[PDB]
Structures are given as C-alpha cells and as structure tokens.
Design a protein around this ligand. Sequence first.
Ligand SMILES: COc1ccc(N(Cc2cccc(Cl)c2)C(=O)Cn2nnc3ccccc32)cc1
Ligand SMILES: COc1ccc(N(Cc2cccc(Cl)c2)C(=O)Cn2nnc3ccccc32)cc1
Lengths: 304, 304
Amino acid sequence: SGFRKMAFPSGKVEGCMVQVTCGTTTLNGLWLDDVVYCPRHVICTSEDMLNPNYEDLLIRKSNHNFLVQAGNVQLRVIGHSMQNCVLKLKVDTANPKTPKYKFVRIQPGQTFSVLACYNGSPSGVYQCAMRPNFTIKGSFLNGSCGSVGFNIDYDCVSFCYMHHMELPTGVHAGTDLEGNFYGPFVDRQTAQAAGTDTTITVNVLAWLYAAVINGDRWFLNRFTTTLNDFNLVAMKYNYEPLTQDHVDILGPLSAQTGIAVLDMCASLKELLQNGMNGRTILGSALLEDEFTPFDVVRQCSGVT
Amino acid sequence: SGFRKMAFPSGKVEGCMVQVTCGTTTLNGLWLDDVVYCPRHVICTSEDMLNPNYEDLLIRKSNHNFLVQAGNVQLRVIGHSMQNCVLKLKVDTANPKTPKYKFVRIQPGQTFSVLACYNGSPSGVYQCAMRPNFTIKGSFLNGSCGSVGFNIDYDCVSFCYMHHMELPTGVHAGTDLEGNFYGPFVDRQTAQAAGTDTTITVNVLAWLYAAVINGDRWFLNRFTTTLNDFNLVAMKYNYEPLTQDHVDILGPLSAQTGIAVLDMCASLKELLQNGMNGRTILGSALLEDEFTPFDVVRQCSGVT
Ligand SMILES: COc1ccc(N(Cc2cccc(Cl)c2)C(=O)Cn2nnc3ccccc32)cc1
Ligand SMILES: COc1ccc(N(Cc2cccc(Cl)c2)C(=O)Cn2nnc3ccccc32)cc1
C-alpha cells in the first residue's frame, strides 16, 4: 500500500545524455544510435534569443563547431541538420548504451518522467504531466535545455519531450523528439502567455480510485451524477470536460473498486463544491491530476 | 525556476538489483561487490512471520537454497550470513556494475530516493523522508521487500534504507544496510504501532525558502519571532522543535534570500495559525516537509 508520485527508473536515459556546446552555449543532448538530438537554440547567444533567424545562424556553423562530450570523451560530429526546433548531430560512433526506443508525441493530460540534466550530467528525476495548455510545471535551471521526458514500457523508452524554455510565467515549454513544440510556443524570447491551466479530470478520478485502493475513503458519498451534470460543475471549476472515452478508460479501476465511474464523479463534484474541510487524500490537500488511469493501475499492480 | 519532489537518477542503483528466492519467498536483493544483501525474512513463509525464530529457520537453509538471479543469469552463492535483520549472500562474481558506495544510517528528517523493485526489476523511483517516528510513507506492494533507499554525492551512492515491511497502519519500516531497523520496529507480523508523525520543521522552512526563490512569496509577513516563541507554536501543531543547529543549517538559504531564519519562522507560525485560506505554495495546499535544506540548495543550484 501507499501511493507516490513515482518516476520511471532513469538508468536507460542516463546512458543517453551528452553535453552539447556551440560557441558559448552549452546544453544537453540525447544520444541514440549515431545521432545526438538537442534544441536548435544551442546555436544562439542570450541576445540572439530575442529575434533568432535559425536558418541564418545555422549557416555560420560547421560540424566542428558542435562539441559533443559523452562523459569525459569527445564525440566526432560528421553531419548536422535542423528538423523543426531540434538539431540532429550525426556522430561517428553509435551510442553503445542505446536502449530500445520510440519517439512519441503525447496528448495533454499524459504523464512522463523528466531526467533533469546539466552539462550532460543527470541531476534528478521527477514525474510530471503535459498540461491542457501544453506547458509543463518542471524544475529547470539555465543549462537544463535538452533534458528529456519519457515513458518506459518494459525495456522500450518512448521519448516524448525535450526541454527548450521557460516562459516569463515560470512554466516550461518544449518539443517532441521531432522538434515540434507542444502547444503554440516558439523558441524565441518573446511575449508568449500560456492559456488556462485546467485540471485533468480523468487523472483526478484515477487518483481518487488510487485513494480508495490505498485506504483513503472519507470522500466517498451516497450520490451519483451524469456526465452532463458533472461537466456543468467541471466547467465552473476549470476542470476538463469528462468524455465517454475517459469513463471507458476508468473501467478497470471502477471494476477493481466496485465504485461506478459516475459515483466517483459525484464524489469529485462534492469535493469541488465543499472543499476538503482541512482533510487530506493520499497526503495531499488538493486534488492531484498528475496520475493517469494507466499510472494508477501500473503502480497499484507493480509493473516492472 | 520551478521546484519538484525530485529523486536521484536511479541508474547506479538499478545496476545492483537482483532477485532473491528462498523456498517460496521471492524478494529483492542489493548486489555490491561479491555480496548480495536482502531482508532476512526471505527465509520465512507468510505463516512464519507471525512468530519467526530467524536463527532456527536459517539453520535449515544452505547456500544452494538461496536463488539469486541478476537479470536472466543465475549467481552462485558460496556463503551466507545473518547480520542483524539482513542476510549477506556471498556470491562467486563481483557485480561489474558496482558503483562507489557507502552504507549510512540516516537521522529522522533526512530524505532519500527509493527504487521500488519487484522480482529484482525496477518499477519506479520516488523521493521520501525518514519520518520522526522512524517510518517512511512509501509505495510498496508484496514483493517489494529488499528495495533500497539511497542518496548520491556525484558518483558515490550512500545506501541508507532497505525495505522490510508494512505496518498494519499502511506506513513502512526497514533497516539500514547493516540490518538494524530504523526505530523500534521488528521483522515480525505483530502489533507494532507508530508514534506521532510530527512535521519536520527545518524541512518546511527550507521549502518556504525554495518557494521565495521560485517566486511564491504571498505568505511572507511583517513579523518576526524567537526560537522559544516559535517552538511553543510548533509544539501545538505537532511540529518538531527547531534548534539553533537547524537555524545554522538554514543560514545559506537565509543569506540567498535575505530573509532571516526567525522571520521565516514567523511566516510559518502565521501559516500554522491562520491556514492557507485556499491558497497554494509551490503547487501544494499543505506545508511540505520532505525537502531538506541541502535538497533545496542542491535543486536550486543544479548539482549533478
Ligand atoms: C541560448 O541562450 C538561451 C538563453 C536563455 C534561454 N531561455 C529564455 C527563453 C528563450 C526562448 C523562449 C522563451 Cl519564452 C524564453 C530559456 O528559457 C532557457 N531556459 N530553460 N529553462 C530555464 C530555466 C531558467 C532559466 C533559463 C531557462 C534560451 C536560450
Ligand atoms: C515472507 O513472507 C512475508 C509476508 C508478509 C510480510 N509483511 C507482513 C509483515 C511482516 C513483518 C512485520 C509486519 Cl508489521 C508486517 C510485509 O509487510 C511485507 N510487505 N512489505 N511491503 C508490503 C506491502 C504490501 C504487502 C506486504 C508488504 C513479510 C514477509
């Protein structure tokens, strides 16, 4: 028993982190096979970030200008290309520690682990979610760019995120491993405001199911609701609308606990309207939305 | 910016996890050099746990009864010994992935990362604290025993915890790597109740300093207090007494922010007395105590 904000074991990704330096800018790169992926803003100075012309800046760079260091050994760059907002640096040596991997573009509400890195060296690992406004609430300092987000399915790492920037509001933005930003963000230091950070309803419900499984049941009530009635309350509280797809996804947790999805919705509706009254659920005084229904089943079943 | 409950990168510890089976009991072991460390209750059945005589149960076991599997390859056991509540299984092969390591016995209030494992395979990593009542609030299912807690200082892993059991109350108990339990717990399925789970005051103050560094400053007030006055409030709220040693430990955070330790204590005193009023600090609606002052400096400085 017990329910924690758990990250995936990071070893497979640690074996892929490298340092990439271009001129006076140093950030992290991801070395998979004979390619090193990193943010294209490695070619920029802090001044260039105000209005960068990446194509023009990149013309002035040659393979020997991209310094890639894996541990304490230098990798030889034999090609470079820009794909969307990432650079792919072809090196002459395949990473011997390349795990089985996929590049996946995640949907908002999905969770992943981030291995925060500086100078190609891992500092820590934490679990987070892609917000509905396409930002992430991470922990990134200057130099963390190129740190990646991933999920693991047994021995296959699905990379979903590469860190690019911090918005003036303190939230984070980045790309998938094809270099396409999540949401409307651009790699330019300009006025970019995030939209409404709504709560991921299906995740809150999954976490309420984890609470029941792990003993916290005080919030269960004698009520039920409908999807339309629940959604009227969800709209009022800036919660994402719950769909029949979400209800279906919560089926296995509903079956395990014997609590119908709409009954759990009615419990959530009362928590929104009445608050917690100074009580906690799974050690939290707010409704947690960074656990997907798949995370709840995975953690509650012990998938390795 | 941003502040997350970050765990240490787990790769160095992943390279040490093995499966240990004795009879019909399977749990995890830690393979360092030519020794595999695991809970001595690997020799027990569920029935034996009610009243085990470990010395007598161990007499009936020989080296060939301890099956140790590292990945998909079997390790040869050439010796076994019981040290306190752990078994040390000497194997004929040194772990080639043995990191630089130390065994450390931590004090209550100190934090560490846990690599939850099942069948010698890592499932996840999370950060937690040794509670003042010597329990941990982890996420452990049956089969997780022998999963370890650790801290990393650059390339040296300091192992501090090995998981042994779940108390009837849902909290966790275990030993250091010398096999001595933290607190008064014993490896017997009996009435063992945890004492008061007080809040780690020095950690809450460190986390308030992290909040100021990372932008959340609403809770800062125009007051100050003394250690004795603060402690009268801390006692009332089941917070650990703050000592001059704690004030000294918070010195660097006080210097960085320009907020005197006793002024931050007065802010904490008002938060205890008035509550949060529906507001949050670093995304939390309660005062977080699982970050030490060293964790705050480490995360806010980007130590790798
Ligand atoms: C090459 O020199 C720089 C210099 C600065 C950046 N910027 C600014 C920027 C850049 C494009 C967009 C926005 Cl909204 C903002 C970053 O956000 C990079 N970054 N990422 N996580 C951080 C955490 C703390 C501080 C800086 C952090 C990027 C490149
Ligand atoms: C060899 O067979 C068993 C069988 C059971 C246990 N017990 C019971 C016990 C044992 C000594 C003390 C207490 Cl208070 C309680 C455990 O607590 C082991 N364990 N650890 N984390 C768990 C999470 C969920 C379920 C079980 C979990 C140990 C050995």
